Amino acid sequence: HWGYGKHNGPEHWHKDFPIAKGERQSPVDIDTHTAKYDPSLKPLSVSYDQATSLRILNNGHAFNVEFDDSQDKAVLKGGPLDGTYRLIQFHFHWGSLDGQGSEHTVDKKKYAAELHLVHWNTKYGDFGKAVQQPDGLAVLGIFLKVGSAKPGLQKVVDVLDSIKTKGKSADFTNFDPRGLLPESLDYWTYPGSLTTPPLLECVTWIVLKEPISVSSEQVLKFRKLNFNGEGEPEELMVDNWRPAQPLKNRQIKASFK
Ligand SMILES: NS(=O)(=O)[C@@H]1O[C@H](CO)[C@H](O)[C@H](O)[C@H]1O
Numbered sequence: 001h002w003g004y005g006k007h008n009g010p011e012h013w014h015k016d017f018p019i020a021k022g023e024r025q026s027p028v029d030i031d032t033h034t035a036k037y038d039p040s041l042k043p044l045s046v047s048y049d050q051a052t053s054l055r056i057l058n059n060g061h062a063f064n065v066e067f068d069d070s071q072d073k074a075v076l077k078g079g080p081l082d083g084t085y086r087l088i089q090f091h092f093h094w095g096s097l098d099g100q101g102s103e104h105t106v107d108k109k110k111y112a113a114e115l116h117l118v119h120w121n122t123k124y125g126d127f128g129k130a131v132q133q134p135d136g137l138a139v140l141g142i143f144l145k146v147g148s149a150k151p152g153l154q155k156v157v158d159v160l161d162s163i164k165t166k167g168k169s170a171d172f173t174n175f176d177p178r179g180l181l182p183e184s185l186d187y188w189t190y191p192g193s194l195t196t197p198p199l200l201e202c203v204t205w206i207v208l209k210e211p212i213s214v215s216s217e218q219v220l221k222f223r224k225l226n227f228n229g230e231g232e233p234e235e236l237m238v239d240n241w242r243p244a245q246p247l248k249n250r251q252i253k254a255s256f257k
């Protein structure tokens, strides 16, 4: 099926998912000199105090840390968002080298990796219904650069050995996502889509200006994961990022000057 290889990568997705060449695809390059400061934007509210993590799974494309989204425990509000969005999972996109890995770029600059915290609009009842709506999801994107270690990320790094291959999952309770956030919540925002098939155009992207730092050792452990399932030939899980797409008829707004 779809993947990130030469024969099933991003360049091939449009054949099975024509929306890949749609009007509001992601990711995009954020040209800081074209983004418009919007003083009308409300303060961004990240309420992850009651976040309830459940499990970590290797899905063959990346690994997802899933949360219990049966109640308004961990939510995202404010900013360009109207209503309440519940956190359902987070995952990363990374490269084979430190100079690549992020999906969004800033003035064409690529970061080593990108964290995506996925939330769905509660007004729609469930995730499945939400992805069918133009304002169904809100994804918080955080860039990762190689430098000092990120304490809040080490817990995730410590369990990767237990989910090396596709299909593997491990218990991952009591994890605090607040430990993955940078100091500043300044951001850019624009209407976009999921960056992996089905590429649905249901996402309000909120990309933070300030990247978080992770150690070389931490990123290396991400690169030890496998795209393949147990027993199959090894294919290192690296470069699971989609390149920037045309901005077309869209404007990127900034929460800061
Ligand atoms: N990369 S992405 O747009 O957040 C994409 O979203 C999908 C729907 O939530 C799934 O979570 C994919 O795992 C994720 O990569």
Ligand SMILES: [Zn+2]
Binding pocket: 091, 092, 093, 116, 195
């Ligand atoms: Zn993602």
